[PDB]
Amino acid sequence: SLIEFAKMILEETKRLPFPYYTTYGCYCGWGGQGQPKDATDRCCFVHDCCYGKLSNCKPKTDRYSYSRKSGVIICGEGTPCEKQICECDKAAAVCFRENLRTYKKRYMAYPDVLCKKPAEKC
Amino acid sequence: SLIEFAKMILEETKRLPFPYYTTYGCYCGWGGQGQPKDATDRCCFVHDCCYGKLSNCKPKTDRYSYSRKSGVIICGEGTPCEKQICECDKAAAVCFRENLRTYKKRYMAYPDVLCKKPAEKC
């Protein structure tokens, strides 16, 4: 679901999902358009496309389980749906972790207006 | 800022702000576009009205400190903004906690067209 993704975000970025990544740029937010701002903002783009590939599943609601080995998310527990959703969340979270340097705090609460131009094909 | 408020939400409701409250109801989850359908949904309304009484403060971005006595949030000293913003966030988080008995997980990502637009005046 989005809960495990949130916990993943906290575990990988050491920053809470809100407000750091739920109101960011043009895609890191409930429904996004336009081109993505920075590298972090694009991670959410890839996350959406990833979710979009899983039409056979319910990425936002279907809860899953995940564990760690050498400090890396495994997420290999249940259904292929859950597995792939977990995979998307893992990719997005790691992408957040790898772009802490590029991360701009000014892009928090980046308005839907000035977010131009709608949109970008996956 | 919303960072401190997020940490307050996590500390008081024992749940991450996202997705439990960022996406809740018609006011919390839809940028205050709709009428609150819950007590905890109304908490966001009162919180937002608290930000309204404050100017020219920047509640979203301006940081502040807060301690914890016997289970109670203690706002730090400084600019009047930093204190009153903290009081808004505190009142809001405490409000979230006190209405955990009313909290409905099913109100997460509530349908937009089911929301009554707009909300009331503060």
Curated annotation (Swiss-Prot), chains A, B:
> What highest taxon heads this organism's lineage?
Eukaryota
Q: Which UniProt keywords apply?
A: Antibiotic, Antimicrobial, Calcium, Disulfide bond, Hydrolase, Lipid degradation, Lipid metabolism, Metal-binding, Myotoxin, Secreted, Signal, Toxin
Q: Which SUPFAM superfamilies match?
A: Phospholipase A2, PLA2
Name its co-factor(s). Answer: Ca(2+)
Its localization reads: Secreted
Where, by residue number, does the polypeptide cross the bilayer? none
Q: What is known about the tissue distribution of this protein?
A: Expressed by the venom gland.
Q: Where does Ca(2+) bind?
A: Y27, G29, G31, D48
Q: How is its activity regulated?
A: High level of membrane cholesterol content reduces cytolytic activity, whereas low level of membrane cholesterol content increases cytolytic activity.
Q: What does this protein do?
A: Snake venom phospholipase A2 (PLA2) that displays local myotoxic activity. It also displays anticoagulant action in plasma and edema-inducing activities. In addition, it shows cytotoxic activity to a variety of cell types and bactericidal activity to a variety of Gram-negative and Gram-positive bacteria. PLA2 catalyzes the calcium-dependent hydrolysis of the 2-acyl groups in 3-sn-phosphoglycerides.
Subunit architecture: Monomer. Homodimer; non-covalently linked (alternative/compact dimer conformation).
Family according to the record: Belongs to the phospholipase A2 family. Group II subfamily. D49 sub-subfamily.
Name-wise, this protein is Basic phospholipase A2 myotoxin I
Provenance organism? Bothrops asper (Terciopelo)
